[PDB]
Amino acid sequence: MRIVVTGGAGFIGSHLVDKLVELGYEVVVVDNLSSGRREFVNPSAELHVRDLKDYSWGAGIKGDVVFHFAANPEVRLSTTEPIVHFNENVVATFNVLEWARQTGVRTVVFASSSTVYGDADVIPTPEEEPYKPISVYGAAKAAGEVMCATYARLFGVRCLAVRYANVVGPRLRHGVIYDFIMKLRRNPNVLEQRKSYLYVRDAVEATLAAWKKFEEMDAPFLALNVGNVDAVRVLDIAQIVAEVLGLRPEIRLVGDVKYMTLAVTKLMKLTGWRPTMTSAEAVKKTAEDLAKELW
Amino acid sequence: MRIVVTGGAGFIGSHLVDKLVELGYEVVVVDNLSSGRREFVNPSAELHVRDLKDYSWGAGIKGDVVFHFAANPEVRLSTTEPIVHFNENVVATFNVLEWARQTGVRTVVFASSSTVYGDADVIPTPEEEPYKPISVYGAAKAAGEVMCATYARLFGVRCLAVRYANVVGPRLRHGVIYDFIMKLRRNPNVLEQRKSYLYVRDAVEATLAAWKKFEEMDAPFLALNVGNVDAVRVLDIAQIVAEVLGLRPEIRLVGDVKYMTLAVTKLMKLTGWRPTMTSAEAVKKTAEDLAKELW
Ligand SMILES: NC(=O)c1ccc[n+]([C@@H]2O[C@H](COP(=O)([O-])OP(=O)(O)OC[C@H]3O[C@@H](n4cnc5c(N)ncnc54)[C@H](O)[C@@H]3O)[C@@H](O)[C@H]2O)c1
Numbered sequence: 377m378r379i380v381v382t383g384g385a386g387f388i389g390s391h392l393v394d395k396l397v398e399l400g401y402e403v404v405v406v407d408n409l410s411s412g413r414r415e416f417v418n419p420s421a422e423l424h425v426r427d428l429k430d431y432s433w434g435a436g437i438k439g440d441v442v443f444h445f446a447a448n449p450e451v452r453l454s455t456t457e458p459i460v461h462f463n464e465n466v467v468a469t470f471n472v473l474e475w476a477r478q479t480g481v482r483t484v485v486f487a488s489s490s491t492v493y494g495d496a497d498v499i500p501t502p503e504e505e506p507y508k509p510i511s512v513y514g515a516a517k518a519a520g521e522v523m524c525a526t527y528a529r530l531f532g533v534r535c536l537a538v539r540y541a542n543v544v545g546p547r548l549r550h551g552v553i554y555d556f557i558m559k560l561r562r563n564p565n566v567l568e569q570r571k572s573y574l575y576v577r578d579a580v581e582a583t584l585a586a587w588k589k590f591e592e593m594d595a596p597f598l599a600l601n602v603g604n605v606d607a608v609r610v611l612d613i614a615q616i617v618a619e620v621l622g623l624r625p626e627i628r629l630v631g632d633v634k635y636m637t638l639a640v641t642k643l644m645k646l647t648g649w650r651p652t653m654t655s656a657e658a659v660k661k662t663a664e665d666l667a668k669e670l671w
Numbered sequence: 672m673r674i675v676v677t678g679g680a681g682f683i684g685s686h687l688v689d690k691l692v693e694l695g696y697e698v699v700v701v702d703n704l705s706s707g708r709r710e711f712v713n714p715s716a717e718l719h720v721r722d723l724k725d726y727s728w729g730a731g732i733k734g735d736v737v738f739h740f741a742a743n744p745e746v747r748l749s750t751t752e753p754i755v756h757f758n759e760n761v762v763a764t765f766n767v768l769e770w771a772r773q774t775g776v777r778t779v780v781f782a783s784s785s786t787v788y789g790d791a792d793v794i795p796t797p798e799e800e801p802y803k804p805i806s807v808y809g810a811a812k813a814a815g816e817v818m819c820a821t822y823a824r825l826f827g828v829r830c831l832a833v834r835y836a837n838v839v840g841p842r843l844r845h846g847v848i849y850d851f852i853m854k855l856r857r858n859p860n861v862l863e864q865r866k867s868y869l870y871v872r873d874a875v876e877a878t879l880a881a882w883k884k885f886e887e888m889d890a891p892f893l894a895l896n897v898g899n900v901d902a903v904r905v906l907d908i909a910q911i912v913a914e915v916l917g918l919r920p921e922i923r924l925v926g927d928v929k930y931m932t933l934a935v936t937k938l939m940k941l942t943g944w945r946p947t948m949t950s951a952e953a954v955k956k957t958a959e960d961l962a963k964e965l966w
């Protein structure tokens with residue numbers, strides 16, 4: 377079948393595309409290359425440079441299923457104008473849903489985020505917890521979810537919403553690991569929250585496993601958390617990154633959720649999926665990957 | 672203080688403006704006159720014809736509190752293009768929130784809808800029930816709520832979200848009562864769901880009473896149902912309208928929520944408010960009001 381992957385030129389998207397290609401799917405990538413790169417696009421995938429903010433972004437693009445992973449990266453949320461978060465998330469997602477409805481797309485796999493929970497009262501956070509986002513980005517993802525669920529109930533466009541915790545691995549050009557490497561690259565002698573980290577390989581496997589199970593279900597909409605079972609502190613990451621680079625710098629402490637960890641009991645019970653690496657191991661591996669890419 | 676009322680030229684909005692003016696507030700009306708009318712605007716209010724779909728709709732407009740009631744009317748939801756519902760509700764609301772944030776507005780009174788509940792499992796429906804909209808309009812209102820709550824928690828722009836059931840009264844130019852009158856006006860001999868109806872007078876009083884109590888609270892966000900305690904069936908309304916017009920026509924049965932009734936226990940307990948008319952009485956009065964306006 378034909379699979380459309382928005383944001384397929386980005387971090388998670390490019391890795392998702394690679395696995396879909398390995399599985400034999402005909403993959404169509406749609407990306408405006410704002411944060412993604414052509415070098416990350418699998419040679420077997422068909423790239424279409426379009427901007428999801430445009431209502432007619434999908435003109436001439438056909439697919440049976442769409443993995444909507446396009447959006448501005450989830451980082452430095454307080455430094456980006458609210459309108460940007462709104463347009464790149466809420467408007468883009470609505471345009472994807474309208475395209476899906478009008479073209480007869482049967483399934484929408486929406487890349488959501490733990491930010492929809494904001495500062496959750498329960499951690500690990502179960503899917504049952506309500507929307508309490510503290511950032512515009514988180515509100516935008518939550519709004520995207522509401523619209524997706526409605527299109528599923530009203531137009532039959534089924535949707536699996538994947539609420540990702542922190543995902544890390546090769547090709548990553550944003551996030552705490554990236555920032556630390558670039559800082560040490562600036563000054564290896566000096567280096568200026570507890571969250572769950574999942575290696576991109578595990579994240580992609582979990583996502584595809586959930587999608588398969590979802591396609592074997594009849595529920596119009598389903599939200600599922602995707603992340604590791606443990607978590608690591610900022611200072612731990614800083615330590616790991618330094619060791620990988622063989623450095624011993626001085627740590628200098630100079631709407632962002634402080635603590636985050638999603639409960640993945642539903643995912644594991646539904647698919648039998650299990651993480652292959654702990655948060656600390658995923659961070660270490662990623663640092664080694666990015667070292668060859670950035671150092 | 673200065674009070675901004677978007678959609679103040681419409682049904683609920685014009686009546687809200689009238690009461691605010693009677694209370695002594697300096698009212699500023701912002702309306703694009705798409706469904707509202709200049710004849711409904713109180714002489715003491717300052718009218719500004721702007722389109723909320725424009726990011727800079729509020730340039731030069733200042734206010735301490737904003738009653739955001741602007742939006743396309745909640746009717747014939749399946750006949751209007753999804754993009755229209757999205758733009759007039761989600762985009763418009765976001766632009767109102769950004770304006771409120773950038774201008775220092777302290778309170779946003781958002782006109783929400785029972786449609787955010789969709790086909791609720793519990794009826795009367797308590798505020799605790801989750802978002803399960805079955806129409807694009809309902810998803811748009813729910814998304815508006817999520818954004819409002821986030822702006823309250825993040826930027827301090829406090830918001831009271833009023834989930835209205837069906838409101839009826841003078842100046843109404845849409846809805847079942849209006850449609851029935853126009854049909855009988857077309858042919859008084861022939862006339863081609865159970866919901867709660869509240870006379871606009873009661874709706875405005877409840878809204879203002881809730882706002883006052885909300886301003887005496889410290890909670891960033893609050894959602895409150897506003898509607899009658901009872902309900903009436905479509906055939907009952909048809910009967911009432913006919914009697915008012917002194918007619919005896921033949922009833923011919925030829926994403927819309929089928930059954931709706933909101934629990935108003937929170938509202939009554941918080942403000943001591945009580946409806947002055949039953950659903951059937953509100954419908955009868957409205958028919959008498961519209962008779963003089965349309966017949
Ligand atoms: N830890 C994580 O990486 C993480 C966590 C939570 C949620 N997510 C979600 O996963 C998805 C991918 O995130 P990522 O980390 O890979 O970020 P990324 O920036 O690497 O990937 C996003 C892709 O979307 C593309 N894009 C952005 N706006 C577009 C537009 N208007 N039109 C077309 N393409 C557009 C970007 O160019 C990029 O290629 C996003 O929805 C993100 O919210 C990621």
Ligand SMILES: NC(=O)c1ccc[n+]([C@@H]2O[C@H](COP(=O)([O-])OP(=O)(O)OC[C@H]3O[C@@H](n4cnc5c(N)ncnc54)[C@H](O)[C@@H]3O)[C@@H](O)[C@H]2O)c1
Binds near residue numbers: 679
């Ligand atoms: N039973 C009801 O009347 C009911 C039920 C549930 C919710 N509501 C909500 O109450 C509010 C008012 O509803 P109403 O029944 O009075 O409908 P209405 O159409 O009479 O009033 C809406 C007003 O908003 C104005 N408007 C629309 N789009 C605009 C834009 N882009 N820029 C500026 N102004 C714009 C319209 O011209 C109109 O004057 C809406 O938010 C509606 O969703 C009403």
